[PDB]
Amino acid sequence: IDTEKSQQALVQKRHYLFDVQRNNIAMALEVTYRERLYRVYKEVKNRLDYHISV
Amino acid sequence: LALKTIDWVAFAEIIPQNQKAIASSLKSWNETLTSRLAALPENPPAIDWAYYKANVAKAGLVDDFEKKFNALKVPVPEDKYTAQVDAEEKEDVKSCAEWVSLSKARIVEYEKEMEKMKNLIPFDQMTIEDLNEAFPETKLDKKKYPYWPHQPIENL
C-alpha cells in the first residue's frame, strides 16, 4: 500500500514538466521582444549621435 | 509576465530515464533565460528629442527619424508553441488519472486482503486445511508427490 500511494503522490507531481517548458516558452518570447526593443532603440539612437558627431 | 514557480528536485523525480538529457537542457535554458531577463529592463529609455532637436543642424532629418519611430510597430512575437504543449498536458493527465484509478483498484484489493490476514482465526483452533486456506503455500502438492508423506523426506 505504502509503495502504491507513493506512486500516486508522484503521479500528482507529474505536472512540473509542462510548466517548465511553458516557462521557457514564456521567457524566450519575452527576451526576443526586449532584444528587439533595445536593438531598434539603440540603432536609431546611433544614427542620431552620428549626426551629432560629424 | 506571469511565470509559474518551480522546484528542481521535484522536477527530477518525474522524468523517465530515456529523456534525462532533455530535462537537463530544460534546466540549463531555464537558468539562462532567468539571467538574461535579469540583465535588462522592460522598456528602453526613449531619449527626449530636446538634445536632438537643438543639436542637429541637418535640415529636418531629426524630425522624420522620430516620426518614423513613434509610428514604428515592432513585431510582438506570438506564441505558436504553448497551445500544443497544453494539449499534450491534457493528454498526459488523462493517462495519469486512468493509472491512478488502476492503482487505486490495487490499493482497495490489498486492504480487503490485509483485513483477511488481520482477522485470522487463532492458530490453536486451526485445522491444517484451514492453514492451507490461509497460506496456500503450505499445502502439499499431491500431484508431484501422491503418496505419503506427500513431500521429499529432506524437507520433512
State chain B's maximal CA–CA distance in angstroms.
Answer: 120
How far apart are the C-alpha atoms of B156 and B39, rounded to whole Å?
79
Beta-carbon-side half-sphere exposure of residue A18 (alpha carbons within 13 Å): 16
DSSP state of B19: G
**Taking the CB of residue A26, how many other CB atoms lie within 10 A of it?**
18
- Is B52 at the interface with chain A, CB within 8 A? yes
Indicate the DSSP class of residue B7: -
Q: What is the interface size between A and B, counted as CB pairs within 8 Å?
A: 122
Contact A14/B92, CB-based, under 8 Å? Answer: yes
Amino acid in the structure at residue A8:
Q
Structural contact between residues A30 and B79, judged by C-beta atoms closer than 8 angstroms: no
Is the omega angle on the peptide bond into residue B75 within 30 degrees of 0, that is, cis? no
Closest CA to B141 of B153, B151, B130: B151
C-alpha cell at B36: 538574461
Question: Exposure pattern of B9-39 as b/e (b: 16+ CB <10 Å)?
Answer: eebeeebeeeeeeebeebbebbeebeeebee
Q: Which three cell numbers stand for residue B67?
A: 516620426
- What is the enclosing helix (H) or strand (E) of A39? helix A16-53
User: How far is A48 from B156, CA to CA, in rounded Å?
Assistant: 103
> B14: which residues sit within 8 A by CB, 6+ positions away?
A10, A13, A14, A16, A17
Q: What's at A4, amino acid-wise? A: E
Min Cα distance B155 → chain A (Å) is: 34
Q: How many CB atoms lie within 10 A of CB B56?
A: 19
Burial class (CB in 10 A: 0-12, 13-18, 19+), B115: exposed
H or E stretch including B29?
helix B20-38
Which helix H or strand E contains B112, and what residues bound it? helix B83-118
Quickly tell me which residue has 502438492 as its cell. B141
- Give the whole-angstrom CA distance, residue B24 versus residue B20: 6
Q: Record the resolution, in angstroms.
A: 2.6
Torsion sign across C-alpha atoms B27, B33, B37, B43: negative
Say if the Cβ atoms of A8 and B100 lie within 8 Å.
yes
Note whether B122 and B128 are within 8 A (CB).
no
Asked if the peptide bond before residue B149 counts as cis, ω within 30 degrees of 0, the response is yes
DSSP-derived secondary structure letter, B138: S
Q: What is the DSSP letter of B152?
A: -
Chain A contact for B80 (CB, 8 A cutoff): no
- Record: contact B14-A33, CB cut-off 8 A: no
Q: Contact A13/B108 with Cβ under 8 angstroms?
A: no
Residue A2 touches partner B, C-beta closer than 8 Å: no
Does residue A8 contact residue B100 with C-beta atoms inside 8 Å? yes
Record: contact B43-A21, CB cut-off 8 A: no
Distances (CA, A) of B72 to A36, B49, B65: 12, 16, 10
Given CB atoms, is A14 within the 8 Å cutoff of chain B? yes
| CB contact set of B81 (below 8 Å; sequence gap of 6+) | A25
C-alpha cell at B84: 500544443
**Grid coordinates 522624420 are at which residue?**
B64
